[PDB]
Amino acid sequence: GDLVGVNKDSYLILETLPTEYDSRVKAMEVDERPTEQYSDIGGLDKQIQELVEAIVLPMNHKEKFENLGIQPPKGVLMYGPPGTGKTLLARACAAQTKATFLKLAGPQLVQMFIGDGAKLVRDAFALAKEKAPSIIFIDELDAIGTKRFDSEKAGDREVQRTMLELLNQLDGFQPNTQVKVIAATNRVDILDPALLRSGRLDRKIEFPMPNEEARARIM
Amino acid sequence: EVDYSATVDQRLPECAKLAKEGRLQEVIETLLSLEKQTRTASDMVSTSRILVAVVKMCYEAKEWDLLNENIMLLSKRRSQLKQAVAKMVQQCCTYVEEITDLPIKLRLIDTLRMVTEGKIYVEIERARLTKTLATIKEQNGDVKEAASILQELQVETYGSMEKKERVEFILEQMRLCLAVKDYIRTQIISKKINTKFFQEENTEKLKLKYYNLMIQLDQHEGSYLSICKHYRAIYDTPCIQAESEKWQQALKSVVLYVILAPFDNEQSDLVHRISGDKKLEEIPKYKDLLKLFTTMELMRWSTLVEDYGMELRKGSLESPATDVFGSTEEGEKRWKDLKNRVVEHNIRIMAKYYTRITMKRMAQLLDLSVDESEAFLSNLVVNKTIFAKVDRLAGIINFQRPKDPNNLLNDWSQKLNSLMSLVNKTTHLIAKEEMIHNLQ
Amino acid sequence: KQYEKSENDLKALQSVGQIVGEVLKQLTEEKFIVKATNGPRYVVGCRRQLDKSKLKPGTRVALDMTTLTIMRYLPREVDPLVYNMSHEDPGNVSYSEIGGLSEQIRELREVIELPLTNPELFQRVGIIPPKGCLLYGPPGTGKTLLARAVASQLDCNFLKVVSSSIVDKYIGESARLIREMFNYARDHQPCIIFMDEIDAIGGRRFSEGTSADREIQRTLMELLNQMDGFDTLHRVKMIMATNRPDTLDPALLRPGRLDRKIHIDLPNEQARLDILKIHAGPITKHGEIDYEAIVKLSDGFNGADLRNVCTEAGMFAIRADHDFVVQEDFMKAVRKVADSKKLESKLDYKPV
Amino acid sequence: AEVKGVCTEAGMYALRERRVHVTQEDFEMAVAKVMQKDSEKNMSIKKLWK
Amino acid sequence: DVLPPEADSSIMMLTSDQKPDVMYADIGGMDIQKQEVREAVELPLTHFELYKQIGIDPPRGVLMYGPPGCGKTMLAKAVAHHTTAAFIRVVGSEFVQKYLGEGPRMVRDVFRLAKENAPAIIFIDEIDAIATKRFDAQTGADREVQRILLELLNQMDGFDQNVNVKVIMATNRADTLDPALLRPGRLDRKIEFPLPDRRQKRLIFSTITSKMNLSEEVDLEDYVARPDKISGADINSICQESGMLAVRENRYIVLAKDFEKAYKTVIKKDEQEHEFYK
Numbered sequence A: 001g002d003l004v005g006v007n008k009d010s011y012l013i014l015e016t017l018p019t020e021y022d023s024r025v026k027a028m029e030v031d032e033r034p035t036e037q038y039s040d041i042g043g044l045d046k047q048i049q050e051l052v053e054a055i056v057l058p059m060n061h062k063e064k065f066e067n068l069g070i071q072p073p074k075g076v077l078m079y080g081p082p083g084t085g086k087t088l089l090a091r092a093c094a095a096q097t098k099a100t101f102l103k104l105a106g107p108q109l110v111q112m113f114i115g116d117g118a119k120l121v122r123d124a125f126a127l128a129k130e131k132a133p134s135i136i137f138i139d140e141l142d143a144i145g146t147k148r149f150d151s152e153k154a155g156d157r158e159v160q161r162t163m164l165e166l167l168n169q170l171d172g173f174q175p176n177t178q179v180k181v182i183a184a185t186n187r188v189d190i191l192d193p194a195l196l197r198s199g200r201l202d203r204k205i206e207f208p209m210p211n212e213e214a215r216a217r218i219m
Numbered sequence B: 001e002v003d004y005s006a007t008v009d010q011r012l013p014e015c016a017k018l019a020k021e022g023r024l025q026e027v028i029e030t031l032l033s034l035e036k037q038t039r040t041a042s043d044m045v046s047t048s049r050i051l052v053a054v055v056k057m058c059y060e061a062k063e064w065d066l067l068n069e070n071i072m073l074l075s076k077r078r079s080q081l082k083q084a085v086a087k088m089v090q091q092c093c094t095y096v097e098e099i100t101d102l103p104i105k106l107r108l109i110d111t112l113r114m115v116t117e118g119k120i121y122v123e124i125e126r127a128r129l130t131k132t133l134a135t136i137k138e139q140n141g142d143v144k145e146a147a148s149i150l151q152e153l154q155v156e157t158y159g160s161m162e163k164k165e166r167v168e169f170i171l172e173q174m175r176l177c178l179a180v181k182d183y184i185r186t187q188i189i190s191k192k193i194n195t196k197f198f199q200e201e202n203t204e205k206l207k208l209k210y211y212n213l214m215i216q217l218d219q220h221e222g223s224y225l226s227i228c229k230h231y232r233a234i235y236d237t238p239c240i241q242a243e244s245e246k247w248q249q250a251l252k253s254v255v256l257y258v259i260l261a262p263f264d265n266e267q268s269d270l271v272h273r274i275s276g277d278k279k280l281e282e283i284p285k286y287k288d289l290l291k292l293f294t295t296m297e298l299m300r301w302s303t304l305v306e307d308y309g310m311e312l313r314k315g316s317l318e319s320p321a322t323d324v325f326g327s328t329e330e331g332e333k334r335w336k337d338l339k340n341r342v343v344e345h346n347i348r349i350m351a352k353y354y355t356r357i358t359m360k361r362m363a364q365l366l367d368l369s370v371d372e373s374e375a376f377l378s379n380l381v382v383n384k385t386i387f388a389k390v391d392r393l394a395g396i397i398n399f400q401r402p403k404d405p406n407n408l409l410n411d412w413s414q415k416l417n418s419l420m421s422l423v424n425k426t427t428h429l430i431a432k433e434e435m436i437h438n439l440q
Numbered sequence C: 001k002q003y004e005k006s007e008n009d010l011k012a013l014q015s016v017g018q019i020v021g022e023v024l025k026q027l028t029e030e031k032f033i034v035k036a037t038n039g040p041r042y043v044v045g046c047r048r049q050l051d052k053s054k055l056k057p058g059t060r061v062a063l064d065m066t067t068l069t070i071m072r073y074l075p076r077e078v079d080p081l082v083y084n085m086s087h088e089d090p091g092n093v094s095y096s097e098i099g100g101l102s103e104q105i106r107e108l109r110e111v112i113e114l115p116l117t118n119p120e121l122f123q124r125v126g127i128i129p130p131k132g133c134l135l136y137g138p139p140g141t142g143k144t145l146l147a148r149a150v151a152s153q154l155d156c157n158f159l160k161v162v163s164s165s166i167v168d169k170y171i172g173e174s175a176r177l178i179r180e181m182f183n184y185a186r187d188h189q190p191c192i193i194f195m196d197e198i199d200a201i202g203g204r205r206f207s208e209g210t211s212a213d214r215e216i217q218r219t220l221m222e223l224l225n226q227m228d229g230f231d232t233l234h235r236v237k238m239i240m241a242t243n244r245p246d247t248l249d250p251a252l253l254r255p256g257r258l259d260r261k262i263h264i265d266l267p268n269e270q271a272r273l274d275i276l277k278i279h280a281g282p283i284t285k286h287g288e289i290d291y292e293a294i295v296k297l298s299d300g301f302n303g304a305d306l307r308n309v310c311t312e313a314g315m316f317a318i319r320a321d322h323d324f325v326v327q328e329d330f331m332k333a334v335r336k337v338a339d340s341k342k343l344e345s346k347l348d349y350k351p352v
Numbered sequence D: 001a002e003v004k005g006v007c008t009e010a011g012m013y014a015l016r017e018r019r020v021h022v023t024q025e026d027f028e029m030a031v032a033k034v035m036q037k038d039s040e041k042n043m044s045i046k047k048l049w050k
Numbered sequence E: 001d002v003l004p005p006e007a008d009s010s011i012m013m014l015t016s017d018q019k020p021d022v023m024y025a026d027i028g029g030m031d032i033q034k035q036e037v038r039e040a041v042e043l044p045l046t047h048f049e050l051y052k053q054i055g056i057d058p059p060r061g062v063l064m065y066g067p068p069g070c071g072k073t074m075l076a077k078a079v080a081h082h083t084t085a086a087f088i089r090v091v092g093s094e095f096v097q098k099y100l101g102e103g104p105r106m107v108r109d110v111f112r113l114a115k116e117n118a119p120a121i122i123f124i125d126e127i128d129a130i131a132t133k134r135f136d137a138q139t140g141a142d143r144e145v146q147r148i149l150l151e152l153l154n155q156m157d158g159f160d161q162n163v164n165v166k167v168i169m170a171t172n173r174a175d176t177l178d179p180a181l182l183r184p185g186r187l188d189r190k191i192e193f194p195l196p197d198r199r200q201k202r203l204i205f206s207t208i209t210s211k212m213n214l215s216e217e218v219d220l221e222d223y224v225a226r227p228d229k230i231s232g233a234d235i236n237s238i239c240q241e242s243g244m245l246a247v248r249e250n251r252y253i254v255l256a257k258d259f260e261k262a263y264k265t266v267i268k269k270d271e272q273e274h275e276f277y278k
């Protein structure tokens, strides 16, 4: 399955080439590195610590976790009412963190052709793994994480199926301990239990409609 | 998973002391408690030692009922380890060897069989105990029951039991089956043994047992060639061949039976192989018999009975006779059989030559009146032995098959082709001789 | 060494490839019909010094490019996809780490391991050993962990796939992947196929549906007929894994394809204690740790949740900036993870 | 369709009997089988509805 | 140059090593089904002086439709073991291929190879992969499947009633097939393979336990009597799990308890409707 270059007529392999990823996957990669410091978010002071400790701390000081003899958490999900500060925190984390970021959107992994969303997910996790430790940010995770159900209407099965593939990628055979995941949803009441499970999306963080002190801080 | 070795080792001496003192109940109860604790702990060795201790103590109590009951309860103890049960059973087997009381023996053996029915971890012992019980029911003059009890054991299946015991068990089965006077089951049981096994390291007594049981089996209805084969194998056995009498009797039987055999390709090859036996010289008259049965020329029954009549049937002090032609009913049957084989060889020999032979002259030469010779020929033809057409109306016996013109011309062609090849060969020899004598 | 590599490269430059194609029939002593992989069929010769008894109707063969002369035979192809399906790495989980499953692991080993060493028992009783077993149960219980333990401990080969990664866009390609996988297994006996999330392709075959639905159903018919079809499968074992056994084709649950339906449910009190002990071992701890208290505050949890109790316990311990896990941090962890459980929808599905 | 099937069935039964002709007894048996399978299909549909 | 009749790629059963190993005696019961499948692929092969005396046109193929596990692929396997004619086996999921014109090409190649060998049987297992009634002829893929299906019909209709090439196909859902297959001239027999009834349950138990050690204690009449709709494949898992327990406890005999546990294992009873009905 490697990628090599061959002579046009003698068909003799002549050089090794960089692996191929679907252009759609490659576009998901961050290049601009947004610039939003941890001062720009006020009123979410517990949540910010939770997520920073979960995602960034392991990457820098892994010695602490090795000393305590604990595997660090796997995954973080952010849920709160619309406009409560979800994507802004992740953008800030990308601004300060240095590992490879990958963006995404729930609706970006749904493709018309059967078997294309799974290939997108698999190649994205592969690029994240290959390019040193990294984080994936699946915004609008509710697009693909919907509960499964028994219905005679087709179409939804394909999204469910790429969802199964994402589930398996997070925590499944061949454990992955170099990539971490983030997500954001306005509705957590419709996400699959196998995705809120305590092994794939471990730390779940709530974002409340800001309180008086938070409103003054934001303004 | 949790050791109990120290507890059991400490306790057991006290338990034995108390039992021998007369505290059987307390010691048995404490042993049961330790067994339950260990088994819940899953300690195979401690449980085995405790179980053997109990079985030993109870036996030196004349508590046959108590011993048997305790064997039952130990066997059905829940989560009971298989190794512990096996050790208890081997102890019980030794003991069954020891005890002597007929009712006590029978009851203990039955209990051992019931606890020993259907389990790999104790599977040898079941066969051994069944063999013992078959023995006991046998020397009580009951044979059918012995045959059934023995046949109920499928020795081959057991993958752990060693080979020699397997073969001995099978051989006991076969002897019992022959005793019961049933044979089809014997044929069924014979194939199960492997004849190749009797070559490996020491199978000498078992080999002779097998071959004698067959020879007794094949004599029932008449399979003379198979019996010759088995006697031959016995003769090839080093023990028989080492002593003079043993191998000499082996050869006597082998030659007489190859003689008695029905003529066919196999019997012909066998007789040819046996004939070239340098050791055969020791048995003069018997090698005479062999040659007479391999030479192609009519032989008179009268001459054979006059010369070898006494050396075969009545025996010789110098040369021991064989049961082949003794005074038993089977002796008369096999004597008739030898008559038959001389007559059939006579018929065949005149059936190679003798295109046509008047019925009277065949009957005179075969030493039978017209009718019996005609019946013998008719049976031979109906059985496909030989081909011939009796023209009862003219008294002629034609030995010639039809000659379709196709075959006639084909024979003509073969003759021409042979002529051509001989012409070529004579020319080659001529060239050789001219080369050897002409250059000079 | 530089010149040796240079001359090796220069010699290597002058050499040509052989078209790989399959022999379809041997017409005469020196005539073979070969179907090159692209599709064009040729009638071609054969090199004189080659065992022509090994070119049966189906052998793969390397054809020279100019004359198309058969020149070498090869063993059956192993697609790169199957190379990856066969070279996974289930860490090194041992049966110890699996806590709280004893009956289930026994049944699993009975199904797949015993017939691979001790067939004589099955011959003595007189039965053919079962082929495959479904692992069904609430999420986070240990299905995949059991499969990884079976893969690492056992000695036969392994094949691991996600049913959601078999499917492919072009019509008639997923079925070909399944068929070729089972052929590969049929070659390297013994082998175990672990279909993960067979609910991704095992779904009731409807009367009414759409084109993609029909394509996946074709894939499923292929699998079904590979398991127990015209060709007896013999010595390759199977295990599946689903959180939705109910949404499966009745023809796939039939007890000739999936012989055993093992349930892997949520841990019970003693099992909870076992898992807690297994996960809490490698921690660096101070003071007494009364696992009865956590077993009591962890109703409804699953193995992952108790692992998370340990992880969160250490997270709290660092949050305080100590260097140990004390009991109180365990209590905080358990109560927290109890708080987060309100989001998961607790219910189980059965195969009916 | 039932009355079309009864004809072919009866002919085939007569053929098994090894004859050139169909018999009234053969027709009775064929119609019994065809109607039994028809009622079986009807009750199977009813059970599926249930 | 003109080659032998077929180069082909649909290899035909070697009937030498690939012949299956299910005798007619491995099956138990299904006497009526054995008759029809044999009577439909042998009775036209013998005689034929009696099959146009009564005017009934000879059968072309056989459809074998039944619940999921009642012996559909067993009988085909047996008739492939015993029969002398050449055998070609396929699965409908195999005809469907990537490139256009390849499905039709495979169908034509198969039927042509069958026609080359006068006595021949073609088995297409899981015909549901092709002959589905409902279609959506707007995506191409469904168009190619319809193309394969139409090619099958056209090849089936292309016979002269004087070539001994027979076709048998098995489906778990006859109703989902398109009617174009069922029309006379094409597939002319449907053979139900229903779940076993008492007598068949008894026969299959005896025939599957016939290879057991099965101490005399077990009374199978008890297990057969039970009013439980069980498919033949299950009746083999009961008999298999019984010996499995036997081996677990390290025996080589099967007791009544072992069988009871097997039957309670394989036949889990549905969720008892709360008894405030009835």
Ligand SMILES: Nc1ncnc2c1ncn2[C@@H]1O[C@H](COP(=O)(O)OP(=O)(O)OP(=O)(O)O)[C@@H](O)[C@H]1O
Pocket: A040, A041, A042, A043, A044, A081, A082, A083, A084, A085, A086, A087, A088, A089, A184, A186, A210, A218
């Ligand atoms: N606590 C906060 N501190 C600073 N800015 C905030 C805060 N809460 C909301 N905002 C502002 O909200 C605006 C839009 O919110 P944003 O899209 O980042 O949130 P969200 O929760 O991810 O929303 P959505 O559900 O639409 O993805 C951002 O410009 C950010 O400036």
Ligand SMILES: Nc1ncnc2c1ncn2[C@@H]1O[C@H](COP(=O)(O)OP(=O)(O)OP(=O)(O)O)[C@@H](O)[C@H]1O
Pocket: C224, C228, C229, C251, C254, C256, E026, E027, E028, E029, E030, E066, E067, E068, E069, E070, E071, E072, E073, E074, E075, E171, E172, E204, E207, E208, E232, E233, E236
């Ligand atoms: N009468 C029978 N005697 C013995 N075994 C039987 C019988 N009927 C069914 N079986 C069992 O059927 C199993 C195989 O089932 P089979 O392949 O025939 O299923 P099927 O009906 O074709 O299934 P599907 O509809 O899913 O294709 C074998 O294990 C065999 O034990």
Ligand SMILES: Nc1ncnc2c1ncn2[C@@H]1O[C@H](COP(=O)(O)OP(=O)(O)O)[C@@H](O)[C@H]1O
Pocket: A199, C097, C098, C099, C100, C101, C138, C139, C140, C141, C142, C143, C144, C145, C146, C275, C278, C302, C303, C304, C307
């Ligand atoms: N019995 C158990 N012992 C230890 N860990 C467990 C157990 N059950 C689940 N886990 C945890 O759950 C994860 C394994 O998930 P698994 O149960 O194999 O798949 P699924 O998501 O299908 O339940 C691992 O991180 C493991 O630590």
Ligand SMILES: [Mg+2]
Pocket: A086, A087, A139, A140, A184
């Ligand atoms: Mg957002």
